[PDB]
Design a protein around this ligand. Structure first.
Ligand SMILES: [Mg+2]
Ligand SMILES: [Mg+2]
Ligand SMILES: [Mg+2]
Ligand SMILES: [Mg+2]
Ligand SMILES: [Mg+2]
Ligand SMILES: [Mg+2]
Ligand SMILES: [Mg+2]
Ligand SMILES: [Mg+2]
Ligand SMILES: [Mg+2]
Ligand SMILES: [Mg+2]
Lengths: 138, 199, 190, 176, 109
RNA sequence: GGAUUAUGACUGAACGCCUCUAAGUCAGAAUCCCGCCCAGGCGGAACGAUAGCGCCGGAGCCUCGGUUGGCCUCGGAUAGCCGGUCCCCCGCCGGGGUCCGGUGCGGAGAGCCCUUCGUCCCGGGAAACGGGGCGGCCGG
RNA sequence: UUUGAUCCUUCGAUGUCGGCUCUUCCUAUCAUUGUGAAGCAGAAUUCACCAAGCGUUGGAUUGUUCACCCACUAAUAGGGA
RNA sequence: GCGGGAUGAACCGAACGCCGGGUUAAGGCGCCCGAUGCCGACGCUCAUCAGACCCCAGAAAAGGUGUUGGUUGAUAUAGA
RNA sequence: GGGACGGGGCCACGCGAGCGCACGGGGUCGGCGGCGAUGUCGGCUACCCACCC
RNA sequence: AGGUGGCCCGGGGGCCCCGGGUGUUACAGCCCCGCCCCGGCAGCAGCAGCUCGCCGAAUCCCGGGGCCGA
């Protein structure tokens, strides 16, 4: 089975390379493994980009297969992609690895000082919900 | 401080290309279940590739001849001994760090085993090609112990289904006390989200 | 070159309801169920429609060596439906010139002894494949009818008693004996 | 020629030099594909010294300049008339591609003739490169991308960065 | 009251294929896997700690049984994360695979 | 005895017909490989009998060195999987189906548990079924 | 596995023809095992494939390797180290 | 004499006082074995004897509906 | 000729006297700290043994 | 025309898509040509830290690592 399709008018997410972590669309399919790619709002110039550096989401937006740069900006800020991308459960765990890499050593000390009391409470509840299922059983 | 490895789905040259470097760099490696390894190419070509090695015995006293081991362990140890300088005291003091087992012994079943992704058949082979197992190969070439290994690799799968059930049974209790409590750990999470741990 | 898409569809009649879990199909109906797993072929089986009235199979990005696998599954599925609705009946004669060929069924349809072939005292203890029920015909002098549902279990076991009885060391332009196959047919008729 | 990098695209005009015999000579011009502005000159005296009696010692390269592309943001369907020698007897060819620029559809032409014919770099005479509208293409590797509603999935994404997590614990996933 | 150094496995001298130059000894560092990361470990004082039979002096302590060979990290090597090192006295062949330390303290942060 | 060569056949496309073949499936041999049979490795196991000797917790002396936190476990698929419902049919809780949630894996090894400067007062929170030291059984 | 051509190594020495005895090896297969085509009805015979595990003899004359002839046989195949 | 061609009187780089630092040549970078643990780029190829780098240690005429390209005319909404 | 208040650049504008910094005819400190008598500090070479090449 | 508003024939769902045909910007869009100061403006081998180059009398400043002091 398949669900996510390459189709004229789909928004992909560039994984690596020079343009790290930007949503961008697909205008055209040149060949088996090459295309014509543009995103005007996330600070990208209209260029040619392969398929091995993009992983793709379930957003489409309707425009012609060689449309110039305006009709994309109309369909883009019409559907408001730059909020629904940031409202997904997929680009919140990106800034989570950014907050994790940008952690000051004091802000690591306040996690060692927050887990250590935090999980001696869960363990003191599981100890009572094993034998809250054992008083009934015995 | 001691590595472990599985043997299903890994290739033979790609695994021994990682392991003959990681041994020489001071790291004890144990590779278990070396009958689920599979070899590239079809079956009958790797069998004639091996029986043309079994025909090569030293002519005047074959007891001095090439010791043809038949187990899939002492084959994987053979094809590591080739990737090592086994005449010098930095080869003979490295092969006593490696330890190879057929099947899986009880000292290494209640431990989490690591899996190399760079040597897997589904990654490093096109999916329209042919592969060949090693166990059915050794049985075809003189290994007498599949009728024991198959049932000792049956009694532990039955023991680990049970251990996965009681792992789920403690996890649900953990997510229900984590549903009851969070009135009083409401403040020990607004300090974790702003440091990126529960997204 | 690399062809981008090729597909094929099969209509199913409404005495049969089919489904699939993953890649192995199952088809049940008037005479039983059959299951065949296609896990070595790497295609996409889709089953379009409410009431499940037809099937469709795809293969993306394939060369000439695997555009062959579009039709040769549709055939083993039309054969899967025929072997459940109708069921197969292979009729096979028994040519002999001078000695009498003796044919006797052991095990209520699941074994065949063969005697007196070319005067050979050597009986041939031929076993069928589990799934096939042989029989001596009626309203005909010499004839076997093999019946069953799976064609793969029928035709191989039919060819076994065709190769069990051969001719050693002589001509086969003159010595023409054996139980040969006449007609491939179904149990009942549409 | 060493087809290294991507082939840039030069336009060369050249001539013989004036004699007391003739007052002014006429001027010729070609289209040369070259990695730089020197082997376009050493290719120009080969395609001129294969058609007219003109040598390097009796001429001068009047102008040798880069030619940009009129529209490098559109997608175009090229078509190339080749002429290549072989191990036994020369041949002509006509072969199409699909690319943006002529420079990339000849970087592609030299790379595909290297792959499918082992025609080396010193055996290839590019005579004519013309872009075409979509009707007169004859070969099936282009006419199949002629659909307005094209649609295909990415079936089997084999992973990379094979050695960064080099010793992991979990088996991967190749369904996306 | 914990470790204040970083692990480093000695790997080989700077050799060609049929020579060898023992005055420049290679290292691998657990955690670094490219040449672009190893700009942190330039000029860091590395060391090597062994032990022997007799008893020797120790700066700020009673004479123990242990000995050291100090050193220094000079420049990178390869595209993977290997790095060279210049010790004062050239190293023995007993330590191929054993453990040396590298410090951090001639810092540049 | 097993796996199969040579060769002989089945279903079945490419080539709307065909066809032993390209994917899959069957029978098959003085050959190959194992048994029966002969030796038993700087390879192990169980059981005994144990002569100034062993089963059990003190300051000291010579030597041999490498280490400077641990992870106490499903099996497997890759043109697919993971978890709740077992509301419901079936097995002595288990799987099968329906359905509800995730799916570039967050019930993530890019990971999680432990965290070592010491003590004395005074309170706020969280424990109260708690912390530590000895008599009743197994995992095997 | 024939004879020739050449002259690189050994002439302060590599013991030089045949046979007896004795292990192993190759296949370009004479016979036996399993299989195809015939101007193959059976019986006989010729042709080819996988295939070298197992066999391939007793004697007169000659210094003989070579030859030639009498018997038996399943077959009296050819050679190297 | 030296680095490379696994090995080697002549081939390819290069010609020497004893030593520190740097960079290169012919060559090479899965492991032995210093170096790709590049998100390397585009394609052809399945062998029951695949194949893999000057001198070099081996091989052909002819064949193939095995496949990938190509070339010339003669049947295409002229149902061929 | 200014155009009737115009900003930046010109090594243009046969005994002058004293002082100092210096990317200047090949490195100095006019800077320091812990270890030392029967168990320890130095000695490359010369003797035995192990290892990399 | 790399076949879209519509229009029109055909099959699926609880109007919508996917189907094949007709014809000119259609309730999408592209391309070619004339003129409006090479129409007007920012900018310029582009800090949309990568659409495509060669350069420095038309080029200068900081900082880091190593080895050596005759
Ligand atoms: Mg006969
Ligand atoms: Mg058997
Ligand atoms: Mg069989
Ligand atoms: Mg210590
Ligand atoms: Mg002599
Ligand atoms: Mg002698
Ligand atoms: Mg032969
Ligand atoms: Mg060589
Ligand atoms: Mg030369
Ligand atoms: Mg090498």
């Amino acid at each position: 089975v398949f669900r996510r399709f390459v189709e004229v008018g789909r928004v992909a997410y560039v994984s690596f390379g020079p343009h790290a972590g930007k949503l961008v669309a697909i205008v055209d399919v040149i060949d088996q493994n090459r295309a014509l790619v543009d995103g005007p709002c996330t600070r990208v110039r209209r260029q040619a980009m392969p398929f091995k550096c993009m992983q793709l989401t379930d957003f489409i937006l309707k425009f012609p297969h060689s449309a110039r740069q305006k009709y994309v900006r109309k369909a883009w800020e019409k559907a408001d992609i730059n909020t629904k991308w940031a409202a997904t459960r997929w680009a919140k765990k990106i800034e989570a690895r950014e907050r994790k890499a940008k952690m000051t050593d004091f802000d690591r000390y306040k996690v060692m000082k927050a887990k250590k009391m935090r999980n001696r409470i869960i363990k003191n509840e599981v100890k009572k919900l094993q034998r809250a299922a054992l008083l009934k059983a015995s | 401080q001691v590595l472990v490895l599985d043997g299903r789905g890994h290739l033979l040259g790609r695994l021994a290309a990682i392991v003959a470097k990681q041994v020489l760099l001071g790291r004890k490696v144990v590779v278990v279940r070396c009958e689920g390894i599979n070899i590239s190419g079809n079956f009958y070509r790797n069998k004639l590739k091996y029986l043309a090695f079994l025909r090569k015995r030293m002519n005047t006293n074959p007891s001095r001849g090439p010791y043809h081991f038949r187990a899939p362990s002492r084959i994987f140890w053979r094809t590591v001994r080739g990737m090592l300088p086994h005449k010098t005291k930095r080869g003979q003091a490295a092969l006593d760090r490696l330890k190879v087992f057929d099947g899986i012994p009880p000292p290494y079943d209640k431990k989490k085993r690591m899996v190399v992704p760079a040597a897997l058949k589904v990654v490093r082979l096109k999916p329209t090609r042919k592969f060949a197992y090693l166990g059915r190969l050794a049985h075809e070439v003189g290994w007498k112990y599949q009728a024991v290994t198959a049932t000792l690799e049956e009694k532990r799968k039955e023991k680990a289904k049970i251990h996965y059930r009681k792992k789920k049974q403690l996890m649900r209790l953990r997510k229900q006390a984590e549903k009851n409590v969070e009135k009083k750990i409401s403040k020990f999470t607004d300090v974790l989200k702003t440091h990126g741990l529960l997204v | 070159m690399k062809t981008i898409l090729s597909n094929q569809t099969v209509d199913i009649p409404e005495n049969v309801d089919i489904s699939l879990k993953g890649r192995t199909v199952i088809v049940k109906g008037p005479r039983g169920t059959l299951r065949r797993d296609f896990n070595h072929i790497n295609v996409e089986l889709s089953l379009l429609g409410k009431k499940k009235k037809r099937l469709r199979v795809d293969k993306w990005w394939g060369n000439r060596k695997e555009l062959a696998t579009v039709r040769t599954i549709c055939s083993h599925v039309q054969n899967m439906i025929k072997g459940v609705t109708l069921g197969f009946r292979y009729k096979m004669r028994s040519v002999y010139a001078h000695f009498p060929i003796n044919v006797v069924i052991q095990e209520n349809g699941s074994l065949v002894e063969i005697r007196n072939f070319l005067g050979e005292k050597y009986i041939r203890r031929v076993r069928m494949r589990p799934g096939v029920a042989c029989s001596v015909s009626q309203a005909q002098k010499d004839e076997l009818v093999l019946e069953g549902n799976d064609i793969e279990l029928v035709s191989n076991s039919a060819a076994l008693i065709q190769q069990a009885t051969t001719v050693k060391n002589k001509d086969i332009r003159k010595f023409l004996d054996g139980i040969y196959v006449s007609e491939k047919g179904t149990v009942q008729q549409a | 020629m060493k087809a290294s990098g991507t082939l840039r695209e030069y336009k060369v005009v050249g001539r013989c030099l004036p004699t007391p015999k003739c007052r002014t000579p006429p001027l010729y011009r070609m289209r040369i594909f070259a990695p730089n502005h020197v082997v376009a000159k050493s290719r120009f005296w080969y395609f001129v010294s294969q058609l007219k009696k003109m040598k390097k010692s009796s001429g001068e390269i009047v102008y040798c300049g880069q030619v940009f592309e009129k529209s490098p943001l559109r997608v175009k369907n090229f078509g190339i008339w080749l002429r290549y020698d072989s191990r036994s007897g020369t041949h002509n060819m006509y072969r199409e591609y699909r690319d943006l620029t002529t420079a990339g559809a000849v970087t592609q032409c030299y790379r595909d003739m290297g792959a499918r014919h082992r025609a080396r770099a010193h055996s290839i005479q590019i005579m004519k490169v013309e872009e075409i509208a979509a009707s007169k293409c004859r070969r099936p590797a282009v006419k199949q991308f002629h659909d307005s509603k094209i649609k295909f999935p990415l079936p089997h994404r084999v992973l990379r960065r094979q050695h960064k997590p080099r010793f992991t614990t979990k088996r991967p996933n190749t369904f996306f | 009251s914990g470790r204040l150094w970083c692990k480093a496995i000695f790997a080989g001298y700077k050799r060609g294929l049929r020579n060898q130059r023992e005055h420049t000894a290679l290292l691998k560092i657990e955690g670094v896997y490219a040449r672009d990361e190893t700009e942190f470990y330039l000029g860091k004082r590395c060391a090597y700690v062994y032990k022997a039979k007799n008893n020797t002096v120790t700066p700020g302590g009673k004479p123990n049984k242990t000995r050291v060979i100090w050193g220094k990290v000079t420049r990178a090597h390869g595209n993977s994360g290997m790095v060279r090192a210049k010790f004062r006295s050239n190293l023995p062949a007993k330590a191929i695979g054993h453990r040396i330390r590298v410090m951090l303290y001639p810092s540049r942060i």
